[PDB]
Enzyme design. Structure first.
Site, PDB file in Angstrom:
ATOM      1  CB  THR D 148      27.809  -8.637  73.906  1.00  0.00           C
ATOM      2  OG1 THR D 148      29.192  -8.937  73.693  1.00  0.00           O
ATOM      3  CG2 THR D 148      27.274  -9.507  75.033  1.00  0.00           C
ATOM      4  CB  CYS D 165      24.893   1.842  74.879  1.00  0.00           C
ATOM      5  SG  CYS D 165      25.228   1.816  73.094  1.00  0.00           S
ATOM      6  N   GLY D 193      23.440  -0.818  78.972  1.00  0.00           N
ATOM      7  CA  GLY D 193      24.003   0.242  79.784  1.00  0.00           C
ATOM      8  C   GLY D 193      23.319   1.571  79.528  1.00  0.00           C
ATOM      9  CG  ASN D 375      28.471   5.030  74.830  1.00  0.00           C
ATOM     10  OD1 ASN D 375      29.376   5.747  74.410  1.00  0.00           O
ATOM     11  ND2 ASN D 375      28.559   3.706  74.857  1.00  0.00           N
ATOM     12  CG  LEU D 376      28.744   2.329  80.697  1.00  0.00           C
ATOM     13  CD1 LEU D 376      29.017   3.086  81.982  1.00  0.00           C
ATOM     14  CD2 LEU D 376      27.899   1.097  80.965  1.00  0.00           C
ATOM     15  CB  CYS D 377      31.558   2.318  75.865  1.00  0.00           C
ATOM     16  SG  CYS D 377      31.029   0.791  76.676  1.00  0.00           S
ATOM     17  CD  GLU D 379      30.396   3.127  71.983  1.00  0.00           C
ATOM     18  OE1 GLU D 379      30.010   3.368  70.822  1.00  0.00           O
ATOM     19  OE2 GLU D 379      29.743   2.431  72.788  1.00  0.00           O
ATOM     20  CB  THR D 576      34.115  -5.018  70.884  1.00  0.00           C
ATOM     21  OG1 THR D 576      35.483  -4.945  70.466  1.00  0.00           O
ATOM     22  CG2 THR D 576      33.319  -3.929  70.189  1.00  0.00           C
ATOM     23  CB  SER D 578      32.607  -9.552  76.156  1.00  0.00           C
ATOM     24  OG  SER D 578      32.725  -9.132  77.505  1.00  0.00           O
TER      25      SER D 578
END
Ligand SMILES: [Mg+2]
Ligand SMILES: [Mg+2]
Ligand SMILES: [Mn+2]
Ligand SMILES: [Mn+2]
Ligand SMILES: [Mn+2]
Ligand SMILES: [Mn+2]
Lengths: 287, 86, 683, 683, 287
Positions: D148, D165, D193, D375-377, D379, D576, D578
């Site tokens: 994004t 990120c 992020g 990370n924030l996600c 991954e 992913t 969005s």
């Protein structure tokens, strides 16, 4: 002649236990003997039970039967204090000082304690016997409420006051003093309502009501003696507490407009030590 | 006449209909065949019949769908549904 | 209860209708004999004590290495030769609970009063035995009191900074705001309070790189600063205290004030961040005529004019901003904003009110910068230049950030010894040493301004104590005459010592030539007006001391012109709080709040009568709340005209006095030349 | 109601007992014809459009200058030669609401899908017309979706960064904490992020320079970072999302976890800080054996050993810490802590469970550093080195902070085009370009690690959509076989492209020689195990595509040994959530949450059927909540063995399941080799 | 799952009438037309009369029949706010704006008013029909209570909010906003207690309770439309007030866990400006 001033006094006395930080009592609590901690927990648990029923049942039911929106507002406020403030404050104290298992055990202990069950049975029974438009049943419940406010709490209040007066458990003690300050005005107010009903009666009826009040007091008193011995013998204070409850029984009678029943005695001096937007104008800018 | 039950192992209502179908087989199993199909393992059949929730009960007669019932049904309602086509 | 505390409680036990004030000395004797003398570590000699303290990382070795042991022993003998005795129990309690050095387990006491004073003097002298003995005489006579950071941490290894204040300019950038947070934390871990000027930060709804309505205003920066000060809470022993200052013409001024409202939600409210409001004369003029005012968006002004809003004279540029279509603003009501200030100060005591034009009308260093904001105590008023902190691996533009080198004169002990000149000069030398020895590496602007401006703060305390113990009412014109003469003397000798230091070192403060000291404009009222006492009673108080005259001020002006001035700023009157007990003095030049202070310590109730309180001077020790605030404003303005920086002026308000009364006091302070107003204490 | 929304509302209006899925195409046609074409500004020629966009600060003039106008024109023509039609209304709505360029007033649409794709392709190619057309074909076929930030901001002037990120290592100092706050705010300003490792921060009640019990622990830093992310929240376009990661053996682990409790007070509760917990295998061993565990004070370990607690091997150093009297610790119950984790995930979805030993057992860059946090996600699992930020005017020891450039393969479109190799190689080239063109001046460690590590993230999506549209149940063994084969090919071609880039540029990532790629340990399981499909149905999907065999993997291993690897990390599967709508793909490799998503945008509900959902494949699109989480763990572990970084694994739980079921799923994930667990979604 | 959280929110919202000075409202009150003053008076009396029923009956009757000490305490607190705070606040507003004779006449009028009486008696009827140990009758009363707290008050609140959003009658508007904020949380809380009962029912019983709730809503809504025209036509606001009623009806339904009944509408911008732990048992670490 009095409700408005009681309304103002009650609302100006409003407080929450969270206003008082309790972690300061942690050390003086740790330092008490096992006997002392046991008596203290049980004493506050007995108080919690009384306030639970005074808030859930006693004050709301009296509010229902007393006429006048202002009188009802005072009684509703007092009811809120009982269960939303007083009863809850004890849990704040318990949660600070005691582990969960000791807390669970003391609440189990209230359920099975025969003196605490008897006093609840007697007081709540009278509350639930009130009949609509029957002033005599209402008077009897108000006597019971005054005895709860001004007499029955005091076997419990003794111990926090006894410690406060020695400079021990002073944060918990501050909470208890606030509770006591409230109950004193609650007992006076309900006492005045009871006297209103009593004063409407014939002399013959009055004589019967005094008999009821004195018989009830003696019955509660005899039970409270056994309760007091059960709690305080292990800390050596039963005789002292007994003097204190007799002292307060006399105050309850006086709140009801009756003469003192017990002779005066010396109370432990430790326990006695335990007690605008005015706007600016153009002329304020020149001097 | 076939009562086809489209079900899945995770479907709570499908677990409730299972004993109802066993009683129905005991009472009517000489005139009614009961077929169960797991939609988690058999997506092509569930797709072919457009079944887009569970439990879905299809009444089939000689291979054709004659009635469709969605959601849980008590025994008496399933008996009424099947008896129309016997 | 302890014996000393019990004896202290006999102060309020009234016999024959009089307080038992003599019981307080018995309280000191009992306190010492039963607690202090028992719980002070005693060594066979001073050598063993010094070795124990340096070896156990209690003292720094560098400052003691400048003296031979004979010199240190002579200094300590000089401290103990006075045989200083605390006259009130609260003084000894404060010293031996806060400022006396204790062992790492806090069970025992390592430092007496004569020991802390000796160590501070040895630190101040920097290798000079005679200067160290002079400092010992100055402090054991209690003529001069180094500030709490300086008195506490002088010559100790386990310390913070001797600097009391940190005034930080925050530029309008995310890098500058991040550096402001970093520097605020790095100076709060040092102990000193930090004040930040947020008037340069663009308001809420401003643009960040040409995208509009992007900023959340200075309130977000106040949130960040408040949590930064909460994080740097100095162990929690003293909570991290920080101030934020905003110009009243800043657009966020309403949201700046809204954070101190009790009804304010937790999403806007700040707790550990004190707030101050800088009010130029233009706002007061707008309020006076009851005409609509405008609060401006700072970044629009910066884009249009190339200069920050607070770097431009609002009395001149307010109309230019208003008639500028490229400058964004919203109409406000200046009188409504004044009433909001008054009610906010009534409710919470905030904000600090800084009259910018009152500060800059007599500010000597306007060429360096105009005074845009004050400190946490609302008494430091110095020129500051913003620092443009750039992105990483890019050189930063370092400005000037203000710091407190504070020290207080005990007016009572200063005038009893008839040593205004000697005390002021020695205090100036000590503050100069404190400023020179301060080297803060994590605050670049603070360090640069400390090296360049060399600014110090020499305050005074025990004004009300001296006046009441000499039979002078605080509101009486004789008290104002005495304050005028005393603080003119203090200013004269501070300027003289600054010029002498400039002559002896060959250097002045940076950009001295543009200051009014060099041009002689500062000395105009001193060479044109005589500040000798106008009262015979007051003139007798200064007997035996040469009061500087107009000719003496002319000679001082010539001396400053020829030799320069070492300190950009010299005098600022701090609140003088917990250390006022140790000196047995009233706090600052403020009047006493209560005649007998009722203090709670543990499970005991302690009473502290103000020093010298007795039956004869009971009514001279009038409580501050009982005083007329207008006459207190007159007193402070009389003092303020001789103080180059500000004075921590606390307003003492009764419960019955409304917000209009507070606004009248504020406007009279502005009219009388008061620079800053610290607190609104309501009784 | 708009016509397109009403036509989209007709999906759930069932006729003949069947959903009207054909109404979505009508909905998208109505959307375009009635809103998009009408509200798209049109230019007489592409030259006018490019001139208008460059002159009006919409596009960077730098990236368009490397191409002659005929080249850009032909790139656009080959973008429109596809005549791409959005398959669903939600795809076009999401694109033209989130990514399509609009005018400064946000009233007209400046960019079509084929213009965004053309601009991103021209940015990626960097002067190559043929490569730009290759990227255009890649994106217009929707085989590869740039992240994004990259898709939205490539070639734009009003842009942040192209990095999705950032991972920051916070050292145990006030300078490092303040710099971490600064960098977090700087990178949140850039839009990415930020994840922070708080395991190096010393515990609550620790000593600060001989001052004991002075620290606030990591929770004060969480409050600071939370307010920093709230302040730097991208002005309100999207709330500033940050992440804090703490090792489960940190003393503050309970305080770290209590921040997400609903009952937690506002003084300890964070709101914008996502929390993640790093669980070494030692914690799982202690919980399994029910032995009482110890969480340690990091500063004591640092003083005793000279290395931070998270820098040492927990499995080896745990007994040494426990037997060390100088290492302070407190006793905890690991099983009770696991139950607390499960209940926290059930009630709030936090923390992110990271199995450190599951990451480092197959981590190729353990020589550089172990992966201490995600990370924030959850991954991005990369080696990072902490930066020792020193005082001002002192040179900082800059370490490595992870920057992750993300990109997603559309498994459905990649497989339907039989273009795994070309798509993976072009995506690797595009991610390399994004990493190269990205510089961050305010984060020295992020910039240093971007230049040295050159790590990229090539994710995948539409796994469940591809499986369901091919009649494969996501939990079926055939689905796991397809995931194994597809991701083995993806890893093969990513490694091949990285080695080819290293050969062409003559340079590998820093410290490549110590990695398992250089030693060949990475390829052991690839040269030993054949990953061709075991099911004939799955093998038929890879028809016309060369599946890398054991010999091909041996050749690739030799090629990597000879030429090196340009990227330290290549594959990481982001959620992913969005861009999945625009590409008409299921989010990540996760199973679908709902067959027909219900979304409210305004006062109208907008239903989104899953990509390719129909009557024949209704039960293949099984909702993730109805699926066995053990089967989903098996699928992700099958995928994870071919992904060098982590996978955003979200746990989809029913309300009927307890905290013991959540703990069982967590332990099964740990046992099956799952590296990270993202969220615990409850239905 | 919710009572302690609501306890916290309730007690932290505590306020008293005396906190807001009312006299400055006379500076805008004097500038309103007769119809505006008339509507305001009538609306105010409507709110006062309904809130008195809630204080004397609605909250205390629910507190009586609900089981749970903590719930009884929260409910007591809410009853206190009705009687001690809200009722005094409404009286204060009246005494500030109208002379004694005008207040008595407005209350006489509103007491006889057909639309006010219809809704007041419908609600009171359901409170009087609660039977001991019958959770169905309790639920019906809770629905009535939620409809009063979250719906019926809002045809009245509209007007003070309308003035408040325009800068008129700001002191009384601030008071009304505090009252409204209390009624909102009261409605949400009682709604959760009703959902608890609803969720204990069979599917057929649930459908029957839904029909009850919708039928009751319809009766009250049709009377609200008439009430609205009766008061607001003279000041030209009825169309916008009707939108506000429907919007608040939807909130009341959502409080009871039901779907909105009315389509979404925008509201007047002036009024808007005014406004399962299971322990790990081993064998779970092995697969
Ligand atoms: Mg900038
Ligand atoms: Mg360090
Ligand atoms: Mn009580
Ligand atoms: Mn009571
Ligand atoms: Mn109410
Ligand atoms: Mn209510």
């Amino acid at each position: 002649d009095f409700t408005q001033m009681f309304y103002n006094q009650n609302v100006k006395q409003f407080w929450l236990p969270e206003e008082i930080a309790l972690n300061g009592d942690l050390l003086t609590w740790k330092y008490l003997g096992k006997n002392e901690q046991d008596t203290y927990m049980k004493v506050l648990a007995g108080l919690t039970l009384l306030d639970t029923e005074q808030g859930n049942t006693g004050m709301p039911i009296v509010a229902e039967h007393v006429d006048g929106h202002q009188r009802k507002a005072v009684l509703n406020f007092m009811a809120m204090m009982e269960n939303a403030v007083h009863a809850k404050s004890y849990s704040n104290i318990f949660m600070t000082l005691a582990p969960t298992e000791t807390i669970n055990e003391v609440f189990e202990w209230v359920k099975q304690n025969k003196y605490l069950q008897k006093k609840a049975q007697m007081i709540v029974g009278l509350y639930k016997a009130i009949q609509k438009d029957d002033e005599i049943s209402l008077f009897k419940a108000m006597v019971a409420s005054v005895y709860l406010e001004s007499f029955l709490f005091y076997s419990g209040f003794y111990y926090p006051l006894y410690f406060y007066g020695q400079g021990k458990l002073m944060q918990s003690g501050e909470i208890i003093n606030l509770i006591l300050r409230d109950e004193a005005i609650h007992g006076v107010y309900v006492g005045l309502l009871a006297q209103e009903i009593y004063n409407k009666q014939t002399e013959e009826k009055k004589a019967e009501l005094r008999e009821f009040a004195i018989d009830l007091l003696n019955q509660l008193y005899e039970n409270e003696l056994e309760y007091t011995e059960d709690l305080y013998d292990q800390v050596g204070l039963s005789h002292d507490v007994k003097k204190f409850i007799r002292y307060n029984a006399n105050k309850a009678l006086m709140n009801l407009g009756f003469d003192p029943y017990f002779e005066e005695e010396d109370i432990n001096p430790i326990v006695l030590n335990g007690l605008t937007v005015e706007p600016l104008k153009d002329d304020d800018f020149y001097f | 006449v076939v009562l086809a039950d489209f079900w899945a192992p995770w479907c709570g209502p499908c677990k409730m209909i299972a004993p109802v179908l066993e009683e129905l087989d005991q009472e009517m199993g000489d005139k009614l065949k009961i077929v169960k199909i797991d939609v988690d393992e058999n997506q092509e059949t569930a797709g072919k019949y457009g079944v887009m929730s569970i439990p879905t009960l299809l009444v089939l007669k000689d291979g054709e769908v004659v009635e469709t019932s969605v959601g849980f049904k008590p025994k008496e309602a399933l008996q009424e549904l099947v008896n129309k086509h016997l | 209860v302890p014996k000393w505390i019990q004896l202290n409680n006999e102060i309020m036990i009234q016999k024959d209708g009089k307080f038992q004030f003599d019981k307080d000395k018995e309280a000191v004797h009992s306190y010492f004999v039963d607690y202090i003398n028992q719980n002070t570590v005693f060594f066979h000699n001073l050598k063993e004590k010094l070795d124990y303290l340096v070896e156990n990382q209690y003292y720094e070795e560098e400052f003691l290495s400048l003296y031979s042991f004979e010199d240190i022993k002579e200094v300590f003998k000089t401290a103990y030769a006075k045989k200083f005795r605390f006259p009130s129990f609260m003084s000894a309690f404060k010293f031996y609970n806060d400022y006396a050095l204790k062992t790492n387990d806090k069970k025992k006491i390592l430092e007496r009063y004569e020991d802390r004073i000796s160590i501070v003097a040895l630190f101040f002298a920097n290798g000079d035995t005679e200067k160290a003995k002079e400092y010992v005489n100055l402090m054991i006579n209690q003529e001069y009191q180094p500030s709490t950071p300086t008195f506490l941490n002088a010559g100790r290894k386990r310390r913070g900074e001797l600097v009391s204040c940190f005034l930080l300019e925050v530029n309008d950038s995310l890098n500058d705001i991040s550096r402001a947070i970093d520097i605020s934390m790095q100076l709060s871990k040092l102990g000193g309070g930090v004040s930040l000027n947020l008037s340069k930060l663009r308001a809420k709804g401003e643009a960040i790189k040409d995208v509009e309505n992007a900023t959340k205003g200075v309130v977000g920066v106040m949130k960040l600063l408040d949590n930064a000060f909460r994080y740097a809470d100095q162990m929690g022993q003293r909570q991290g205290s920080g101030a934020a200052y905003l110009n009243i013409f800043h657009r966020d001024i309403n949201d700046f004030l809204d954070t101190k409202k009790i009804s304010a939600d937790e999403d806007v409210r700040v707790k550990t961040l004190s707030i101050g409001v800088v009010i130029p004369d233009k706002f007061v003029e707008l309020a006076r005529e009851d005409k609509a005012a405008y609060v401006f968006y700072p970044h629009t002004i910066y884009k249009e004019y190339g200069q920050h809003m607070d770097e431009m004279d609002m009395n001149e540029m307010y109309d230019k901003f208003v008639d500028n279509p490229r400058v964004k603003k919203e109409k406000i009501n200046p009188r409504k904003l004044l009433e909001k200030l008054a009610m906010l100060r009534s409710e919470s005591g905030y904000p600090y009110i800084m009259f910018q034009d009152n500060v800059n009308k007599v500010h000597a260093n306007n060429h360096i910068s105009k005074v845009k904001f004050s400190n946490l105590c609302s008494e430091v008023l110095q020129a500051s230049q913003v620092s443009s902190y750039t992105d990483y691996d890019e050189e930063d533009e370092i400005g000037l950030d203000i710091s407190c080198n504070l020290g207080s004169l005990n007016i009572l002990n200063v005038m009893e010894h008839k040593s205004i000149e000697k005390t002021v000069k020695l205090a100036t030398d000590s503050l100069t040493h404190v400023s020179e020895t301060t080297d803060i590496r994590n605050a670049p602007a603070v360090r640069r301004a400390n090296k360049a401006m060399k600014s110090i703060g020499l305050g005074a305390m025990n004004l009300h104590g001296y006046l009441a113990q000499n039979g002078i009412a605080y509101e009486s014109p004789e008290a104002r005459d005495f304050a005028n003469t005393f603080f003119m003397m203090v200013n004269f000798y501070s300027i003289q010592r600054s010029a002498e230091i400039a002559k002896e070192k060959g250097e002045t403060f940076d950009q001295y030539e543009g200051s009014t000291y060099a041009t002689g404009e500062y000395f105009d009222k001193y060479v044109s007006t005589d500040f000798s006492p106008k009262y015979e009673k007051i003139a007798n108080l200064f007997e035996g001391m040469h009061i500087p005259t107009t000719e003496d001020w002319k000679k001082l002006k010539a001396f400053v012109a020829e030799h320069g001035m070492y300190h950009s700023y010299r005098l600022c009157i701090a609140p003088t709080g917990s250390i006022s007990y140790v000196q047995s003095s009233t706090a600052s030049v403020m009047p006493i709040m209560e005649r007998i202070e009722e203090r709670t310590y543990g499970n005991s109730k302690t009473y502290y009568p103000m020093p010298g309180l007795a039956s004869n001077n009971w009514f001279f020790y009038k409580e501050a709340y009982d005083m007329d605030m207008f006459k207190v404003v007159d007193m402070i303005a009389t003092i303020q005209q001789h103080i180059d920086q500000g004075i921590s002026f606390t307003l003492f308000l009764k419960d019955t006095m409304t917000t209009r009364d507070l606004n009248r006091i504020d406007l009279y302070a502005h009219h009388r030349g008061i620079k800053t107003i610290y607190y609104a204490r309501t009784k």
